Amino acid sequence: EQRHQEWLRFVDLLKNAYQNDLHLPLLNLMLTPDEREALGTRVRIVEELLRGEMSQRELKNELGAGIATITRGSNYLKAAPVELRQWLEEVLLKSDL
């Protein structure tokens, strides 16, 4: 329960950092290179899962990512609220015909 408040304090700190144009150095302080790389790759995974055109072998090759992480992210995406999903489709699939 207190872990939850601690998480929310991070969320609020980062909100305020974006407001003050300090988000880039804050994220450089708070995340390791491997975590930042994972987040960048997760964006690409979410995009391709929302697109829904690739097979599992194709996802692995296109994304340079492992099946275990793709599988878990797909469940997180399934569980996401439609308010978020529709916004992500708008953003991450913005070029798709």
Next chain:
Amino acid sequence: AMAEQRHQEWLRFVDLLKNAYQNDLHLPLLNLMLTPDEREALGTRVRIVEELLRGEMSQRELKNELGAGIATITRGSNYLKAAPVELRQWLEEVLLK
């Protein structure tokens, strides 16, 4: 080469999250994009930063109070030392005051 593509992919995440905050979708986005263990780590890292800036606890004392390992605290202290002065001063204002 790898590295420059990774940086662009990172910036894409930074923009996505910026826009999620603007649309009040940051919490569901971060629930999608991070695991429970990663969120817990970030909450703990805020406390580590806070206590390093406060400068009252020893690092081993910080270990017990935060349930954290020495390796994590030592690494965090280096990231904090490397951070730009503008960020450090803002953190002191928003976390400690």
